[PDB]
Amino acid sequence: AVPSVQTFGKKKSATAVAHVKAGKGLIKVNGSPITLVEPEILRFKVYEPLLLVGLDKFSNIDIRVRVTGGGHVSQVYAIRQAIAKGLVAYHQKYVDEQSKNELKKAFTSYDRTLLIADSRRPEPKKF
Amino acid sequence: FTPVVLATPIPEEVQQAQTEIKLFNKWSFEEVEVKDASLVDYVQVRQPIFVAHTAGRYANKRFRKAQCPIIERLTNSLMMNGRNNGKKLKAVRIIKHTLDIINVLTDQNPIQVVVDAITNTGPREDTTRVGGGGAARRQAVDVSPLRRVNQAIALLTIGAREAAFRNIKTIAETLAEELINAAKGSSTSYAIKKKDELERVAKSNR
Amino acid sequence: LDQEKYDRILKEVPTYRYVSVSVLVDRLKIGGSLARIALRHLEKEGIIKPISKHSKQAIYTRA
Amino acid sequence: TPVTLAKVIKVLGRTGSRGGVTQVRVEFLEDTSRTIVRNVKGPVRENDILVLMESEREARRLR
Amino acid sequence: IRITLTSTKVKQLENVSSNIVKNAEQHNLVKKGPVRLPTKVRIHKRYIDLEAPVQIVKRITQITIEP
Amino acid sequence: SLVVQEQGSFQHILRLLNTNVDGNIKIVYALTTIKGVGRRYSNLVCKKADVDLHKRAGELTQEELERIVQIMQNPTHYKIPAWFLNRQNDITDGKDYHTLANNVESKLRDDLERLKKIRAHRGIRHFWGLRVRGQ
Amino acid sequence: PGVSVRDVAAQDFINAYASFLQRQGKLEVPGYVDIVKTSSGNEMPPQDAEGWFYKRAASVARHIYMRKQVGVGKLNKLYGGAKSRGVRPYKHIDASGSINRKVLQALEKIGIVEISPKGGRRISENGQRDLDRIAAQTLEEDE
RNA sequence: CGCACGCGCGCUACACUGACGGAGCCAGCGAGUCUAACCUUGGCCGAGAGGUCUUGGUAAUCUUGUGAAACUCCGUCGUGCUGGGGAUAGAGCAUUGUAAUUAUUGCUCUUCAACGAGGAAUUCCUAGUAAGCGCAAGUCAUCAGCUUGCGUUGAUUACGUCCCU
């Protein structure tokens, strides 16, 4: 179980693909270091599954973040998706599946902003 | 916290919000306690989220919007005026940039004085506009208990943004007073001045 | 009138509940532009604890 | 006044001019021997919680 | 040197589209791989290079005279 | 910052350059309180004196201004800005008048004295704008 | 560790290396980028007016270590600002280019950034090896 | 298109979530010369404007990843018809148009106005709708303000009937 997959999410028209394979455990989210992440407060807008399942299960992944689009509230609210999408690089081909039940109970209705397409649709103004 | 040693630089404070549970950089949510009968149920932090913006179809059925989230009902004490929502996205900053002063005054976690503060403005009585036929009088009746709530919470929506709009001091830092002694009737303030006037306005001409 | 603020701060930071520029307005001397200047040299005394930094919103906390 | 909590186990719909007023039947919340019919304006349903002020006022007209 | 089609009109594609893949074998002038263009409103625009005599692609062209 | 007070020194309102260039506004915008001096005249002094807009300003010394008298006192050699001023290389005279409170309005309206004594636009109708619009 | 140039923040690279350029004194002071403002989307010229130019002319130390353009009519597109037009909303900014003969022709004075032929400015090994001396006068003092 | 009055339209300013000096640099409905003067990607010419001294293009390539905006972070100012506004207007600059007049909008800098969310009445609102913010276009020789869109980021309050109609 290792996906060699660009797990794809459209950002409402765009290419929000996350490059996914196995790794070493080395978090690279958009160049700047975790010591000096430019929002000090929205720093914690990156970690939902690293307060739920723990830092013990998935320390063997190489996070990549490459999306097209964003602002205040989608750049540093939804690179949070990356540790629900590039932390979980553990479910297709190579390295053992066994941890599967707890990623299909705590990731079923948790936050549909990450684990499925967020339903903030575009804006037709009701003709 | 049994550390896994990394070649990627992470400080001491980043991983603290997991096992040492404080869902801000330095603030918790551990003590949800309530004295009176009005505002118990809707501190909806049960999913392990830092911000918890659950905005789905919580507006179609007739019961489910009572269970609407605390950021999506109750922490709307920050956005009410529209020159700051109309250049909108500067509006994430108030409570976390302000609340360490309230975390000094008899608060280990900042909800501890606020145990007996939010709920104890429990609304019991409010008139309706009587038809009257001429004389627009008022009747001794009861609304649902969301008015002295909104005399203390919707007057914190204005009381954080729109009563700090055009204020002598700043927007978010006139909130060094807004939840210190908001428990019971002081009557000497911007929102507590009409607190007796739900139990006497429906009592004076009844 | 030279260092009356020096004694009525070191004996009154554990009397004033906060440290800000509105402490100085009780004597009715200055309200003006010598305030956002004074946020980066005040706490070399060492009694009140700083917390956060932002260039558009420089906020600290009373102690 | 006693905060006479009225559990809203049954409800009579949504009427009025604007569609806000409501008739409400209540068997009591704390004890289970008061049987009071009331009127409350606004959104209420079956099996909720409300407040009524006085002791055992079975008043049927509160619009 | 190139060819550029011009396209203003989704329902009459499969007469020459199969003459590019299932019946371009009948004159042994092979093609280079077509990139799937993002179809703007429709423009189906093909491009063929010519290193050939005067006959074959102009046989596809000058028999296609039904104006 | 510095917890040090002084002995009757600082004022709050000055009287400087024949009018009120005040002791609560700086060189720059109290020369805007009097009409005729803008921002970058004394903000190009910042690359030579380092005095910007960030203070309550009953603090100025009359010897720093003497290296600004090296920029002021003769209006013919002393770095007068040339894409900046109120009226500047004028039809009126031809020089770049970065003048003062007593010397702007006397050096402002020789375009309004002119054109319809000359039969066109501003020599009767602006005098009508003084025989009617002035009283 | 593998401490490198891209793994530092926004101006803990530019304005943190400018804590040591003030002890050297190296770059060019222009004449009349000063009386003009630096752009159309501006209200007030910069404060410090001595650092003031070090904060601008070393902004290409990491921006073009990474990518390949800062232009003159080309930096219009990257630098759209807040142009309150009164009747219209904010819009796009056209910038200055005269005494970038003393500003953007002061970028090659440090030897970090040279000028690219695609349009813009590019980096060499002189801006990747010597930055392991001069930007690792910050990067090897953050380690 | 000149102004005793009066209305509406949108856009603002009446402030410290404000904008400013720079780094963190994203979209698409994308659109660009034939029997030629278009889109524009090299430094600088230039206080500034772009000419396209050049180049790339019959086109998701060359503009283009429209390196878009509101914007996030080191420095700027604690309430002073105010570092709020450029309101009105002048002087030092263009791309043009056979000439900028009743200046056609692109360009550097001062003049800094009424107005303390403003009496009556209200405009649209539910799983993607308020709310800002851009992009480029018939407006373009001077831009979009109207507009049709797309894109960016996306709040209190809710399933109800006539009280208005």
Numbering used by the authors:
A (entry chain Q): 3 to 129
B (entry chain F): 20 to 225
C (entry chain Z): 42 to 104
D (entry chain c): 5 to 67
E (entry chain U): 22 to 62, 85 to 110
F (entry chain S): 2 to 136
G (entry chain T): 2 to 144
Paper text:
Forming functional ribosomal subunits is an extremely complex and energy demanding process, which occurs sequentially and requires the transient association of 200 ribosome biogenesis factors (RBFs). Endonucleolytic cleavages of pre-rRNA release so-called pre-40S particles, which are composed of almost all RPS and the 20S pre-rRNA, a precursor to the 18S rRNA bearing a 200-long nucleotide extension at its 3′ end. (1) Pre-40S particles just exported from the nucleus are called early cytoplasmic particles. They are composed of the 20S pre-rRNA, all RPS with the exception of Rps31, Rps10 and Rps26, and the RBFs Enp1, Ltv1, Tsr1, Rio2, Dim1, Dim2/Pno1 and Nob1. Furthermore, most of the identified RBFs physically block the association of the translation machinery by occupying functional sites on the 40S subunit.
